[model samples]
Target chain A: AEVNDPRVGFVAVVTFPVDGPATQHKLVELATGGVQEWIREVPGFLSATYHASTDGTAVVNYAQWESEQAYRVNFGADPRSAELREALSSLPGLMGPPKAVFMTPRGAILPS
Target chain B: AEVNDPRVGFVAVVTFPVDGPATQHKLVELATGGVQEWIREVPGFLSATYHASTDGTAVVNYAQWESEQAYRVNFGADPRSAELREALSSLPGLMGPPKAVFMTPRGAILPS
Candidate 1:
């Protein structure tokens, strides 16, 4: 399923609830730590990064996979991700459900 | 400022109104044509591509620019892009306002 199609990819934007001064640092630490660790270990994970907006309402996660199926497999196989999700879930009103979209590139114009 | 900063980029998601039978072909033709032309001609345009959702209501444009400033300058100077925007506008009730966001990459974990 890791075919080199050059057209398929995935992009996900997950927004977390506003963290106050007390929990902000912990939330940032937890999110970044979990993401970095998962990306390092996940199979077929080409690359990934986590971005926190200035206002802290958004944490957009951009990831590149060998293919869409590769990504799906990693998502299903990662126990650490499940742990991270559970930890995040404990934050209750502090985070929103992840909103993700799969994409297939079209009419690409590459740089010279 | 075309600085080689690995952290900055831009992503825009634009949704077009659902075009009917005849209009669908025209819209795709116009869009793909305009985008290809502008991308080829615009300066500091590192790379870009257009993606249409299966339903055709969403067109996500992902671009990697040398910097935020470079993107801004090109956006302001490109007459072809202005022309494209105008052409798209004329298709009234056929598109939504473009939602664009500037992003700075963070904590990147590159593919090995």
Candidate 2:
């Protein structure tokens, strides 16, 4: 399955500093209502799953895209990129630059 | 939505050191067969999504569980935990400890 067997995908895993659960909620709250909210309609978009750290320290976004170029244009090349960056930076209490790792699916062991 | 909305869950954002694409492939290759393979039957286990970094250096396991206690017990308390640890430890070229971040679902942006 080289990029097409199961499905074409892209996942961005990022973590931000947080104090506790409420902070975690607020972080994602700003994300959902801001970037994710605005960016959901770009070309090739599939879905973005927001993961809140159990200890309220970070959030990881498992996003799927139609292809790599699609992701790049939407996330990196678009004019919205700067605004998105500003939006994230504007969020209060965010610690450190988000450690964003772009990834693809290798395989999975799904529970039936 | 809270833990019960849409579904209850847990996700582990993990990253392992890899030299290149091959190393990353080898990493998830071992995991899909090792931990996910053996841990599938544990109580509360739902599904584990294996993410492979395209640039090749890390992996993020988005694991969903029935409950928080379910996760702690299965991944933490169950006697098999030691065995799984042994299996992971035995793998080759795995860099320093995997960066594991545990999370819960807050919300998602889905496309129709």
Candidate 3:
């Protein structure tokens, strides 16, 4: 999603801690391959961008959604979200459960 | 910047830990006001979006630059950048120095 888009009512800054740089690719594969495919179809899912840290310690998923309620409907109540969460957590080289922060855009500085 | 933009060769996911939700607004004001105004003029800076966590514990600055070297030149060597950084760190209610991760986009899931 466009980072400055005002229509983005909800943002999930989820950080996946990796063991090292070597395992970074694995986490990216898990996130972008299957997880993303499923998330894209969920209602109110606007967009998700996966960022692999250069130092290989973490992978940050910057995801935009329609609203906080939308995220709750899928991630909170939906069993499938839980299932996927478990699967991802079980992945090798993943240090621990991802830390997530729910946020909304406050301001932006764009190129002149 | 567009989260999925390939031109974003360097992404700085900088996180500011807040004492609570009450201070989140103060951090945002400092960031979007002086810091951003000067950063905009720096070459290679694409865009920066400030996200304030609804839970009030954090503020994330998703900044896109031309390349890692560009960041190194400004953040690493530029005296002004360092000065601004110190000023920010001194703010009350901030837990500590901001943690930053250098990253590059791997993939994305956009709305259909």
Candidate 4:
């Protein structure tokens, strides 16, 4: 989905530190699978993009929703949320809990 | 600026820690303005979106390019890169240098 799409009014950017490249791959697998399996079905879910760091130390997810309230009421309370957390926690070499920051787009610049 | 746009072959996600909301605003201004003034002219420039954390502690930029090589060769060594760095260093409440991770999309899930 388009990052600048006005429909995407809320964003949750999450970063997870991995022990190394091997762990990073595992983290990506868990994340993409979680989304493909269920997170994609949530209300207001606009898009989710998974990025693997070139340095091989982290996996970042840039997820978009229709509104912050939508995410709070839907994803936050969903059982799948806890299920995904459990799965991630069990993965070896996961350094810590994901650091997530809720945000709104301030502005955008596109190629002129 | 679609995050999942196949043309956007590379992404740079950068996070900057700021002292508070005020500092966060300054950081966003410098970033958006940098792109507006010159960075947008560089080769492979697709889009750059600035995000302000809801907690007011940080700023993140999700920038897309046509290819990784385009970013490394065109923007990395450009003189304007140094200028932007100098400006950022002078910001009073910028906690530290930004943490930038270069990545290519592992996958994306768009609205169903």
Candidate 5:
């Protein structure tokens, strides 16, 4: 059986910060909020998870979609995503919307 | 020039937690510490960054490498990575070593 079975063909790991009071609490809320919104609305989205590091500096969003076109269209049409973009813009130095790569799974192997 | 240049051919995003305290501060230390160590040792490593979410429940790593072979060889040979594995193992429920995807650049587009 495949350990990581979702087999994400398309993914987007975006990083940004909250506008006001970039506290750890706030960042999580914003990231989770965005992801929840994405999952709810993004067509073909298989699964999604959000990660905020120890410090309050960054948040990484890992999401899986059936295809790149699904993600592109979903992301293009999301209203909440505009808020996310606005929030990131308000940050001191937002560094992404960096294009994510797609991995073709060759089957899973035990981590060594 | 590409807005998000240093296009990554191979990437890996791993999630784990620190053993003790697991506080906001501690998680930052562990995640950043692992990334720094990786940057120093991993060959074909073009760039790397780490993210920790708001509540401190997760840390996401974003990295760029020249090729998959570089990452495989570096990860396979690194001793520090063992410590990362050990630390992750001690966590509540470590989720990955998930296979990452490779993206072929098709030119950059302005964020819309």
Candidate 6:
């Protein structure tokens, strides 16, 4: 994500619960299917990259959006939001609750 | 971050302590001055994106590397690691011992 793009929006980093490999894969699968079917249609949604841990116990979503307001409108106010949360609540796990926050790019140290 | 690239080795997402705006800026200052002056010198380093949260409580580093092994070799075995830790120790906060995990990109759901 660029540092100064006006459309340079918010990023939500969700740290998933650490669990078994099967659980991890299932979690990724759920995100893939869930985002494609659910989040894709949301307004201001730009891109989402799913990351699976090298340790096989986590998933980090580097999601981009148009703005924080746009993000809230979809996830907080959209009618479909609750059902998605319901599904997520059931799939949730043992390590702990996922911590998520919105962030904007500050700077980059690129390779010389 | 793209998934299929062979050089796309690792990402370190570090969630920082929640504090005042000054604290966040100091943290970013510490990272930019520190990473460029310190962490960037590590081997196999590719690129790093620093993110400051809108809520003024967190810092997320989306760092890239050549390989996981390269990352380990630097932070694990290098002699400068201890000094680096000590420096971070002095500037640390209450909410965290900043949590860091290595991740590899798996997939992207892009804009249509």
Pick the DockQ winner.
Answer: 3
In the range B1-112, model 4's lDDT, one tens digit per residue, is 7778888888998888989999988888877774446777888988888888898888888899988987887877888888877888798898888888898778777766
Off by over 4 Å in 5: A1-3, A17-22, A34-38, A91-107, A110-112, B1-112
Candidate 5 lDDT over residue span A1-110, tens digit each: 01134534555565444332244345455545534444454557665444444344445455555667767767656776677667755545454443333332222222
After superposing candidate 2 on the true structure, give the runs of residues whose Cα lies further than 4 Å from its correct spot.
A1-5, A34-36, B1-5, B34-38
Better of 3 and 6 by lDDT: 3
What is the DockQ ranking, best to worst? 3, 4, 6, 2, 1, 5
- Scoring each candidate complex against the real one, what DockQ results? 0.41, 0.52, 0.79, 0.75, 0.04, 0.53
Q: Give the range where candidate 2 chain B is weakest over 10 consecutive residues by summed lDDT.
A: B1-10
TM-scores, all models, native as reference: 0.68, 0.84, 0.91, 0.89, 0.40, 0.78
Error of 5 at A29 (Å): 0.4
**Model 2 Cα lDDT, one tens digit per residue, A1-112:** 1212255566665666766677678877877785656576778776667778777677766666777888888767887878877877777677777767777767766554
Per-residue lDDT over A89-108 for candidate 3, one digit per residue giving the tens place of the 0 to 100 score? 87889998898888998888
lDDT string for model 6 (A1-112, tens) is: 3323456567777777757667777767777784446677677877777788878887777777888877788756987767665665578453666777788877677655
Lowest summed lDDT window (length 10), candidate 4 chain A: A30-39
Predicted complex 3: CAPRI docking category? medium
Better of 1 and 3 by DockQ: 3
Q: In order, what are the TM-scores of chain A for the candidates?
A: 0.63, 0.82, 0.90, 0.91, 0.60, 0.79
Q: Which stretches of candidate 6 lie over 4 Å from their true place?
A: A1-6, A34-38, A92-97, B1-6, B38-43, B92-96
Q: Cα RMSD (Å) between model 5 and the true structure?
A: 16.9
For all the candidates, what are their Cα RMSDs to the real structure?
Answer: 5.1, 3.7, 1.9, 2.1, 16.9, 3.3
The number of clashing residue pairs in each candidate reads: 2, 0, 0, 1, 6, 0
Q: Kindly report which residue pairs in candidate 4 clash with one another.
A: A2-B2
Error of 4 at B23 (Å): 2.3
Q: State the C-alpha lDDT per candidate.
A: 0.53, 0.68, 0.83, 0.83, 0.47, 0.70
Could you tell me how far off, in angstroms, the CA of residue B18 lies in candidate 2 after the best superposition?
3.2
3 or 4, greater by TM-score: 3
Chain A of candidate 6 compared with the true chain A, TM-score: 0.79
Residues B1-112, model 1: lDDT tens digits: 1112353454333445545434444555566664456565566665555554445465555555655677677765667668777786666436556665444444555443
